[PDB]
Amino acid sequence: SEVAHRFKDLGEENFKALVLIAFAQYLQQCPFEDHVKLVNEVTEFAKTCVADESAENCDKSLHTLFGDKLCTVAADCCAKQEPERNECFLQHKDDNPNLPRLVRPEVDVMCTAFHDNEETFLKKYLYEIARRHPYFYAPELLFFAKRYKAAFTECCQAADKAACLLPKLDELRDEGKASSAKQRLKCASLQKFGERAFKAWAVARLSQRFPKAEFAEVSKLVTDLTKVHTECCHGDLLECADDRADLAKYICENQDSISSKLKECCEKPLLEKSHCIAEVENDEMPADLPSLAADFVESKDVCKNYAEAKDVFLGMFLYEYARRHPDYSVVLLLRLAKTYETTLEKCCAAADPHECYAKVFDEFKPLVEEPQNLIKQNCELFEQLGEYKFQNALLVRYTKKVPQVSTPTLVEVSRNLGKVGSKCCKHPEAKRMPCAEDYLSVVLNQLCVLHEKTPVSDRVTKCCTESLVNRRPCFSALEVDETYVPKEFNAETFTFHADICTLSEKERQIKKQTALVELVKHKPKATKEQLKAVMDDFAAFVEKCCKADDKETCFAEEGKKLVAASQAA
């Protein structure tokens, strides 16, 4: 029995949470009560299996069971069987579910609901997250759950809870979203590019982190880590959580052989141990490391070793170049690795290989400089305009690049792209690249998955599927879509009402930002000069109407003077 197996390993508390998340991610539209019902029904069945490991259908696989329990409340997916059925659900996960924005009741209400029924209060948090983020890293979701519990348990018995809770919750909302984003990239990598692309990313990344660890060790870690994510991304949550635990035990046992900063980590609860390890800082670089040129360019055995085991050899190249370059981003190392392999494949087929592949490092120079100059420039620019105007500049830049993309998506992606400046520019040159480029990877992956749902721009598709590691350079290289045909104005689209006054300070910018996007789609060829001169106007239209006697009509009157002057520029 598989269910009995995983139940014992995870316990009832985790087993129940993990199954709840699985159901929330598969059927994101179904209400909370229903999932809760199926979880219990499933959980009890599991208890009978622990005893009689041959009772009802304790012999069946998790998917069969989970599948049959969801099919009692869903249709074409359920008409299929075993493999096809499961794949069906996976293909129907929705990265942008049409769910109602989540609003939080007054502190007083939450603390009452928390104190009264704690298990329920926590199970609904899990449910509301898992249904909105169908790819959230299950094991980590359990970690956020506990921290959420600690938030309430502590703040609800204080002087001013509003002051104690609200903050801790915002920090959690953001970090939860970041977390969801990073995991969305790993699944896309696996699902759209293959495990080989995933493995290479891990080798380079872990080699940067555990520079003292041996290649064979990293390889071992990478292999386990791959299976872990392969499972979480495919919906095998229980085994994912299980396997993740094992990997944490291993890493801790073999500390000495991996990294010296794993101490603090291995001295704490499971959930906190895993989370700790996954976010540990890079270890100190081994003192005397030979030159790479020795074994990879000067040696006359290159092509022979390459021929013998192309995978192991290139894998070793990555590990070696990565370990001594924690100042490079993972994508830059992968571009280098790809440039090195391309040189061997051609050179090793020449008369005198050595001569041909002797200047491969000269090929690396341009690739390393591109990222640096880009970052340098844009951080300087960021420092000058600040985060709000920088987001605006990005909205104009990206709407011009790919005008077809839906206004909600452009607004969302550009805002996030703007956050890269705040999160990264503050670091010194040494840590900027990893920061900047790996964050751009996550955000542009967001644009790619939201766009894959309803493809409208061939330019987006090409930049998203041609190469995982070159997405950033591809998007960067786009200027303006010259074939794009301007859109015709729509009254409703540019009609500002008084309801924009009740909206938070941020909810306003977002509106003014959404207007900017529509404007650029209308006048692609317009200039950053005109645009700014027009935006300022919109600002004026809000301040007056929002504060001018009983006027829900100023929205139409003053909005008229708005569109009028708007149609002019």
Numbering used by the authors: 5 to 78, 88 to 582
Provide the authors' own sentences about this structure as they appear in the paper.
With a typical circulating concentration of around 0.6 mM, HSA is the most abundant protein in blood plasma and serves as an important transporter molecule. The monomeric 67 kDa protein has three structurally homologous α-helical domains (I-III), each subdivided into sub-domains A and B. HSA can also bind drug compounds with similar physiochemical properties to its natural ligands and may significantly impact the kinetics of their distribution and elimination. Later crystallographic analysis of complexes of HSA with specific compounds confirmed that drug sites 1 and 2, as they came to be called, are located in sub-domains IIA and IIIA, respectively.
Since fatty acid binding sites FA3 and FA4 in sub-domain IIIA overlap extensively with drug site 2, the binding of dansylated compounds specific for drug site 2 was examined by co-crystallising them with defatted HSA (Section 2). As was observed for dansylated amino acids bound to drug site 1, the dansyl group provides the most important anchoring interactions for binding DanF, DanNV and DanSRC in drug site 2. In each case the dansyl group occupies the same position in the binding site pinned between the side-chains of Asn-391 and Phe-403 on one side and Leu-453 on the other. The other oxygen atom of the SO2 makes a 3.0 Å hydrogen bond to the hydroxyl group of Ser-489 in the case of DanF; however, the distance between these groups is stretched to 3.7 Å for DanNV and to 4.1 Å for DanSRC. In the presence of DanF, DanNV or DanSRC, the side-chain of Arg-410 is rotated towards the solvent or becomes disordered. This rotation reveals a hydrophobic flanking wall of drug site 2 that has not previously been noted but which contacts the apolar side-chains of DanF and DanNV and the methyl group added to the sulphonamide in DanSRC. The main contacts made by these apolar functional groups are with the hydrophobic side chains of Leu-396, Phe-403, Ala-406, Leu-407 and the apolar stem of Arg-410. Instead of pinning the dansyl moiety in position — in the manner observed for DanN, DanE and DanR — the side-chains of Leu-238 and Ala-291 are found to hold the Phe side-chain of DanF. The dansyl group of DanF is re-located to the lower part of drug site 1, which was previously observed to be occupied by indomethacin; as with indomethacin, the binding of DanF induces a rotation of the side-chain of Trp-214 (∼140° about x2). Since DanF was found not to be displaced by binding of drugs specific to site 1, we conclude that the affinity of this compound for site 1 is much less than its affinity for drug site 2.
